[PDB]
């Protein structure tokens, strides 16, 4: 018999649990499994953060999982990351895009198969070269996510330059003050990073100050053309959607493939120890945890359902693909894709604000 290596997962529904089970079963089939064979162990999300942490211990770590897949339920992955990070058991985020999970101090062994919101800056930057927008105003919310997008785009800029970056307190409903400071500047390209409800506040103010018509360009992310942010969004806005970013099934499939590969690569090495069995009375890290993480971080899976899977230095997905969306006659229209490294414009014409 082979050594049975458990992989864990906290997923949304029993249906997705069955997909995980089936992905692992296929990994066993496609891999040579005389020495090591994977076993799937999963639960669905608990109603609160304390019960979730306890579930991690009683249901998963009790089975010595080498890794834990985690999705966004239908209540963040945080309790799962803390508990698993206590032991240095790696966590693979399947659907969270919050930038906070890219911070090694808090999330020690966290990788994800989707990029953080702030990486949208990579697309904006490619978009600025293409349409030759050399002068831009950046407007971000003054919270972690807003600041992440700013740091990330400033990095790419330091060619095209940011003329000023304006920041606003999240939850503020009258931004006429903030926006009048940007009207007075020359540059008419405006990049926005904000949650749904803050984008709404900006769009309204923007409009009442008549900054949404001919001459002005608005470049935005996914949150800013989602749900309510769409109800008041000006026409001609350009926005982004992460392709498959919400397909839990696709991400389970890919995460399991990367993890199976990494497990097998790990057992090609020596002095691999098992994870702790259960939480109670165990306070030492899993000695092989940091090595398993290194192997994962540098895994490369080319033929992924969600594209080309590689991780960057923070364990964030690289080579993500985006739909480039333009709001035309109040409809979201795909005018292109960012394919991982290249902008590809399709036959549908961009209508700019005004037009």
């Amino acid at each position: 018999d082979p050594k049975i290596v458990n992989i864990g997962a906290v997923l949304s529904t029993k249906k997705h649990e069955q997909i995980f089970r089936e992905a692992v079963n296929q990994a066993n089939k496609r891999h040579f499994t005389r020495k090591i064979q994977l076993q799937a162990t999963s639960v669905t999300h608990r109603p609160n953060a304390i019960q979730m942490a306890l579930s991690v211990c009683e249901d998963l770590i009790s089975s010595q999982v080498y890794a834990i897949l985690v999705s966004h339920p239908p209540l963040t992955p945080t309790p799962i990351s803390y508990t698993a990070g206590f032991y240095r058991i790696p966590v693979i985020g399947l659907t969270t895009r919050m930038s906070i999970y890219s911070d090694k101090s808090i999330h020690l062994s966290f990788l994800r198969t989707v990029p953080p919101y702030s990486h949208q800056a990579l697309v904006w930057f490619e978009m600025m070269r293409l349409f030759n927008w050399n002068h831009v105003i950046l407007i971000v919310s003054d919270d972690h996510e807003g600041r992440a997008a700013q740091k990330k785009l400033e990095t790419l800029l330091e060619g095209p330059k940011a003329d000023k970056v304006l920041q606003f307190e999240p939850g503020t409903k009258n931004l006429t003050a903030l926006l009048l400071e940007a009207k007075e500047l020359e540059a008419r390209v405006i990049i926005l990073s904000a949650s749904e409800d803050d984008a709404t506040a900006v769009y309204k103010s923007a409009a009442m100050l008549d900054m949404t018509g001919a001459g002005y360009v608005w470049l935005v992310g996914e949150r800013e053309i989602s749900g309510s942010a769409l109800r008041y969004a000006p026409d001609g806005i350009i926005g982004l959607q992460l392709i498959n970013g919400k397909n839990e099934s696709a991400h389970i499939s890919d995460a399991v493939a990367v993890v199976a590969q990494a497990i097998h690569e790990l057992f090609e090495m020596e002095n691999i120890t098992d994870p702790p069995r259960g939480c109670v009375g165990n306070t030492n890290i899993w000695k092989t945890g940091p090595l398993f993480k290194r192997v994962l971080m540098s895994s490369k899976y080319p033929d992924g359902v969600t594209g080309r899977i590689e991780f960057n230095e923070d364990g964030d997905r690289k080579f993500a693909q985006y739909s480039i969306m333009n709001l035309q006659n109040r409809k979201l229209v795909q005018v292109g894709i960012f394919n991982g490294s290249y902008i590809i414009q399709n036959d549908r014409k961009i209508i700019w604000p005004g037009g």
Partner: protein, 353 residues
């Protein structure tokens, strides 16, 4: 007068006898606890909370596990219960506690320890130095506190290197070694955890950076329990330390109970009510419209027995009494200085070999 439940949790060999000696009055109940992993700690508190009406929690432990502080902070924030880490890992400074934390720790802030370090350096005219940290939370507070003290001084400070070490990966690529081999300064400030330090020191030695010519200064949480000295710690190691000497456990539990009681009192006597202790952790998602951070404003400013036992919002102590310790040749930690009120008074004029 009405009674508030105060659970006092003692982990490890403790003297309960010595330990067990306002508009509202405390009903203490000492509870022991054997384990300090996340399930044990979450469970013992959630059970303690479903039996009695615990209004606050005083936590002491006998370990060097800084993770305990983070476990508690999470519990405190999830259930909106005050928790005081008065001793052990529970008191190892935690940076960036939750927005809704009611977790407070007996000990100096990261920034103050860093200030204390620069005071030591100025006294012995050690002006040239380098910094090594890991990603352990606080490291930025540490590096920035140094950087802006330096920047704002008419003193010839010179920061030669700042290294950042990634302890989340294995070191089979010899990365840590190749970073360490870049240091030149005779003083090195190290910010990381105790378990991390023992690995770093083992490596620095293999690279000739531990002996004479190199002085390492380190924070309270690296020293941890002074009766547990990893063999890889270099002789001559300097450390700040919360004075467990003159301020023992039974004293700390005293002030612990005082702060939760004084705080409660102050708040009934200005609001005619006190936050009702949630009887369950399994229910904190619904019940949260009805729960509040409110006691924080009082927990933070308690004067007791003419001592100012107050906290910062960041959840560390305002005026900790600190001791500067030096690891001697017999590998025992030796007291060599006191920090009182922004005032450092050392023992030696010339530094010991």
């Amino acid at each position: 007068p009405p009674s508030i439940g105060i659970a006092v949790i003692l982990v490890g060999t403790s003297d309960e006898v010595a330990i067990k000696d306002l508009s509202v009055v405390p009903r203490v109940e000492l509870v022991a606890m054997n384990e300090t992993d996340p399930k044990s700690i979450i469970t013992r508190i959630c059970d303690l909370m479903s039996d009695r009406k615990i209004q606050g929690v005083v936590f002491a432990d006998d370990t060097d596990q800084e993770a305990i502080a983070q476990i508690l902070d999470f519990i405190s924030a999830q259930t909106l219960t005050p928790i005081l880490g008065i001793h052990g890992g529970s008191s190892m400074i935690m940076a960036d506690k939750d927005e809704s934390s009611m977790f407070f720790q007996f000990g100096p802030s990261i920034e103050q320890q860093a200030s204390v370090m620069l005071n030591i350096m100025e006294e012995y005219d050690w002006y040239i130095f380098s910094i090594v940290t890991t990603y352990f939370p606080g490291y930025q507070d540490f590096v920035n506190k140094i950087r802006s003290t330096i920047e704002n001084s008419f003193v010839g400070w010179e920061l030669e290197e700042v290294l950042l070490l990634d302890m989340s990966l294995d070191d089979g690529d010899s990365k840590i070694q190749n970073q360490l081999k870049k240091l030149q300064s005779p003083i090195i400030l190290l910010y990381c955890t105790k378990e991390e330090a023992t690995y770093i020191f083992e490596v620095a030695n293999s690279v000739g950076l531990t002996g004479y010519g190199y002085t390492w200064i380190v924070p309270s949480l690296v020293a941890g329990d002074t009766d547990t000295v990893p063999s890889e710690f270099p002789t001559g190691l300097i450390s700040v330390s919360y004075d467990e000497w003159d301020y023992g456990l039974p004293a700390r539990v005293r002030d612990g109970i005082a702060i939760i009681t004084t705080a409660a009192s102050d708040m009934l006597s200005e609001h005619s009510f006190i936050p009702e202790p949630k009887s369950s952790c399994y229910n904190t998602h619904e019940k949260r419209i009805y729960q509040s951070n409110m006691l924080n404003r009082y927990l933070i400013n308690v004067t007791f027995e003419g001592r100012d036992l107050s906290f910062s919002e960041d959840g560390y102590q305002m005026h900790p009494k600190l001791v500067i310790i030096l690891l001697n040749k017999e590998r025992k930690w030796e007291r060599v200085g006191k920090w009182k009120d922004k005032s450092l008074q050392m023992k030696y004029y010339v530094w010991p070999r």
